[PDB]
């Protein structure tokens, strides 16, 4: 068992209260603070006409990629209707994996077209804009129910 390596401690219940050195930050997301707001807008505001928690995964997946992406769809907080996108810039692999109840809801032609609309922007060199052009496409594709 190890907490955050300096300054954190688990409280009287399971909430682990941590710190942040005073000039530093908490999230350390290596993306600008305005285009991931555009990601959250494309993934919440212009997504609610699809009725599925669009997860986005950027971490490494250095294994059998489909299995290790559908394994990490299982902790998206409702896995039966979730359209996760997984991207590994260590590995150059897009992987859009669905939930159960998202099935035949305008989705089987939207996943390869979402991968194409993402990977047309990844090869330029825009991670966030690739994710936005993928989530907008899969929002236009997944029909609500």
């Amino acid at each position: 068992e190890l907490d955050l390596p300096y300054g954190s401690a688990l409280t009287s219940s399971g909430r682990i209260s941590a710190v942040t050195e005073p000039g530093e930050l908490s999230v350390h997301y290596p993306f600008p603070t305005m285009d991931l707001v555009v990601l959250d807008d494309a993934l919440k505001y212009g997504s609610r006409a699809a009725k599925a928690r669009f997860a986005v995964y950027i971490g490494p997946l250095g294994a059998d990629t489909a299995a290790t992406a559908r394994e990490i769809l299982a902790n998206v907080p409702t896995p039966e209707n979730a359209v996760l996108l997984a991207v590994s810039p260590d590995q150059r692999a897009i992987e859009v994996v669905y939930g159960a109840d998202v099935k035949g809801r305008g989705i089987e032609s939207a996943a390869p077209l979402g991968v194409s609309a993402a990977a047309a922007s990844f090869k330029e060199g825009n991670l966030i804009d690739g994710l936005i052009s993928a989530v907008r496409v899969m929002s236009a594709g997944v029909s609500p129910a």
Partner: protein, 552 residues
């Protein structure tokens, strides 16, 4: 093994979660946010009122606005900087973080805090409402001396609206006084005694004591003045005893009012230091006695404002004003000991704290320089006294309120500020403020007395007024970074997930989430000493925290 978070938090919030929640506030948090918002709005109103005065004083003519509008201008300005900007924010930071600091779920009378805030706002609007009146608001000063306020003199409607606006604002701040003193007395976390509470809730304990001492005499004085104006009721009659009957009990309100102004901002700054000095507050029990040692005497010091009248017992109030200057000096040298041999970083709220230290220093040197009556017999109502109360009072409320905002901002809205923009804010509210008040010492010592609308070209000293105008308009464009910083730090700006966005936080506040939950606490820490958040977040520190906490 990995969480499932949003990429950025909620920017604005959903449509319609605040405006009914405005009307039906009951937690201390949102009420304190409303105090900070609407009182920085009144700070904006006052700042532009001062910039109108300072356009006026830039040239010896009456070139911009009249005489009477100027006499309304400094009066409404002195009120919406003292009794409608400072006086609310001394409970606005209380409603921010005092139930967070004492472990309280809410503030003790959670409707009467909404009642305090809304009585404040609707005393403030009906006191600003003199400007709608055609003769305007009160031309007599903030001091409002009684042969000038009785209805023969300044007979307009604006003075009456001023009177009843301060009646409502005083009642609301009395009610803030009672519910803050009852929080800190009997609504408190189960492990903390009287002494290991933070210093800031201690300063608001004694500040609410002096609010209950002072402000009912403002309402009593002012109900007597409203009767003396409308009923023609001879109480403050000048050929009666009624021009020291104003001065004695009005300044018996007034100087305890300026120390209920001064003490919780001392508490803010004394909370700023131990988390940026990365160490204890130096002499914590010394501060916990020194707040009483200044504030008990604050009541009994009141007539160091009537040195010029020649009708007060003069050595008594001069000796006790030196004796109220000594415990704030104690409270100051504890702060210099708190920065002493620490690992300082001057991220922005400590930078405002240090600006407060420098301004309140040389202003308090003017305090001991001014409280001696022969050195005041030329200086009573000069510009040395107006640069004195700016160079003290601005330093207390404005610098320590910017320290309080840039410190308790990521814990009252869960998002940081821009550090660069806050440093911009500080350096051109420091350079500009010293530009507009380091010269009014030398402008009130050579002659230019207070509350004048114009002066002469055959009088000298025009250049010191124009350099005060340069400094005041540096300070007028100084809050463009501040309102831009909070405007892009609520709806945007760098979020915090974990606690302590300022590391080495302490004082029992910083042991909950940065948007704190409704009723403030999911897990209280085991309170053992004055810094229980510092003892939660650093458990290995505790034996080193106590084993060297006594030498010096």
């Amino acid at each position: 093994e990995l969480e499932a978070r949003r990429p950025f938090p909620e920017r604005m919030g959903p449509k319609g979660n605040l405006i009914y929640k405005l009307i039906t506030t009951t937690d201390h948090k949102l009420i304190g946010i409303m105090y900070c918002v609407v009182c920085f709005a009144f700070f904006l109103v006052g700042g532009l009122m001062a910039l109108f005065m300072r356009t006026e004083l830039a040239m010896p003519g009456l070139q911009f606005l009249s005489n009477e509008q100027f006499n309304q201008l400094f009066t409404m300005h002195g009120t919406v900087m003292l009794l409608f900007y400072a006086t609310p924010i001394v409970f606005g930071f209380a409603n921010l973080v005092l139930p967070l600091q004492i472990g309280a779920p809410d503030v003790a009378f959670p409707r009467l805090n909404a009642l305090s805030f809304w009585l404040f706002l609707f005393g403030a609007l009906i006191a600003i409402a003199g400007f709608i009146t055609p003769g305007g608001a009160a031309d007599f000063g903030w001091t409002a001396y009684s042969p000038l306020t009785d209805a023969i003199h300044s007979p307009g409607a604006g003075g009456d609206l001023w009177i009843m606006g301060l009646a409502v604002g005083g009642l609301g701040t009395i009610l803030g006084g009672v519910n803050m003193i009852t929080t800190v007395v009997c609504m408190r976390a189960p492990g903390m005694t009287m002494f290991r509470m933070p210093i800031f809730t201690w300063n608001i304990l004694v500040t609410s004591i002096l609010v209950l001492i002072a402000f009912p005499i403002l309402t009593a004085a002012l109900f007597g003045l409203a009767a003396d104006r409308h009923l023609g009721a001879h109480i403050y009659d000048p050929a009666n005893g009624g021009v020291l009957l104003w001065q004695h009990l009005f300044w018996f309100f007034g100087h305890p009012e300026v120390y209920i102004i001064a003490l919780p901002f001392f508490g803010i700054v004394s909370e700023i230091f131990p988390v940026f000095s990365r160490k204890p507050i130096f002499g914590y029990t010394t501060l916990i006695y020194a707040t009483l040692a200044i504030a008990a005497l604050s009541v009994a010091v009141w007539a160091h404002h009537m040195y010029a009248t020649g009708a007060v017992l003069l050595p008594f109030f001069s000796f006790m004003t030196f004796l109220i200057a000594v415990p704030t000096g104690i409270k100051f040298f504890n702060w210099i000991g708190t920065m002493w041999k620490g690992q300082l970083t001057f991220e922005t709220p400590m930078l405002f704290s240090v600006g407060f230290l420098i301004t309140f220093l040389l202003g308090g040197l003017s305090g001991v320089l001014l409280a001696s009556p022969p050195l005041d017999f030329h200086v009573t109502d000069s510009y040395f006294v107006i640069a004195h109360f700016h160079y003290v009072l601005f330093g207390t409320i404005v610098f320590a309120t910017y320290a309080g905002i840039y410190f308790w901002f990521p814990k009252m809205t869960g998002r940081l500020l821009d550090e660069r923009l806050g440093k911009l804010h500080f350096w051109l509210t420091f350079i500009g403020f010293h530009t507009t008040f380091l010269v009014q010492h030398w402008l009130g010592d050579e002659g230019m007395p207070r509350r004048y609308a114009d002066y002469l070209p055959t009088d000298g000293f025009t250049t010191l007024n124009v350099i005060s105008t340069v400094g005041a308009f540096i300070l007028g464009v100084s809050m463009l970074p501040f309102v831009w910083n909070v405007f892009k730090s609520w709806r945007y700006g760098e979020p915090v997930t974990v606690d302590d966005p300022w590391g080495y936080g302490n004082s029992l506040e910083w042991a909950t989430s940065c948007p704190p939950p409704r009723h403030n606490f999911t897990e209280l820490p085991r309170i053992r000493s004055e810094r229980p958040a510092f003892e939660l977040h650093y458990p290995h520190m505790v034996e080193r925290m106590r084993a060297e906490a006594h030498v010096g």
